[PDB]
């Protein structure tokens, strides 16, 4: 009264519509271009959400730019994983109410590769039966899970914020169960999924950056994603990325 997890619940971005036209047969171009446009709108919701996260607007504006530019795909993939889990038991990729990627759509050329990585996040969320509260704390933690090699400007403050959300996730795990050995075992399992997201997003961005730089594919990108991708392409090499892991 008020908990940080109830604040996260209030600020959780709404499920947006794709604006997909289903009165014309499917094609990979139409689906990927639509998911790109929808993706730019999801990035906007994520920035608006980050601004309401207690502690974030205390970081310097360059750190705020930095974390969103590094974490945007982690948020989208994780929230897609959550929706696909609750709505289909991780069988369908529930991008938008008007655009579900079912078995048929996955078989479309170029589709399956990016899809399997998304279905892995949802498979894991399903297999661990992640609760709403654990999901909200995990998602905040994914915004604070990658920083530059040399660090952020508000480093001590960033460390305070991340610790706050590591403790919120702890409380959501305790509330869900209440057994001390099973508590840390569940913390281990949830935190393992957070760690494994680094590789999921590394594969998502490697295909995403290939599609963005591909002159032949002609797949469109929204202006918001076009600018983040322009920055993050040189950030992968030389590697100015420090993964903040819970295990290793």
């Amino acid at each position: 009264t008020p908990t940080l997890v109830s604040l996260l619940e209030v600020i959780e971005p709404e499920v947006l519509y794709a604006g997909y036209d289903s009165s014309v047969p499917d094609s990979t171009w139409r689906i990927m271009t639509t998911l790109n446009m929808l993706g730019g709108r999801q990035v906007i919701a994520a920035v608006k959400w980050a601004k309401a996260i207690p502690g974030f607007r205390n970081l310097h504006l360059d750190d705020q730019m930095t974390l969103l530019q590094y974490s945007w795909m982690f948020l989208m993939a994780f929230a897609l994983g959550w929706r696909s889990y609750r709505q289909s038991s991780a069988n369908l990729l529930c991008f938008a109410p008007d655009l579900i990627i079912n078995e048929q759509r996955m078989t479309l050329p170029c589709m399956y590769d990016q899809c399997k990585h998304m279905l892995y996040v949802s498979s894991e969320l399903h297999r661990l039966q992640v609760s709403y509260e654990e999901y909200l704390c995990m998602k905040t933690l994914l915004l604070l899970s990658s920083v530059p090699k040399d660090g952020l400007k508000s480093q001590e403050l960033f460390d305070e914020i991340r610790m706050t959300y590591i403790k919120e996730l702890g409380k959501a795990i305790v509330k869900r169960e209440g057994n001390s050995s099973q508590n840390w075992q569940r913390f281990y399992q949830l935190t393992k999924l957070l760690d494994s997201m680094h590789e999921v997003v590394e594969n998502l961005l490697n295909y995403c950056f290939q599609t963005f730089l591909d002159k032949t594919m002609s797949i469109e990108f929204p202006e918001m994603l076009a600018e983040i991708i322009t920055n993050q392409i040189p950030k992968y090499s030389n590697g100015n990325i420090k993964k903040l892991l819970f295990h290793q």
Binding site: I44, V47, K48, K51, L61, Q64, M65, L68, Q69, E223, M224, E227, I228
Partner: peptide, 19 residues
């Protein structure tokens, strides 16, 4: 027109925008 400091970044514009 007068000199301005309009922000070119869409991300930075979203981060500065109220409220």
């Amino acid at each position: 027109p007068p000199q301005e400091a309009e922000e070119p970044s869409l991300l930075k514009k979203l981060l500065l925008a109220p409220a």
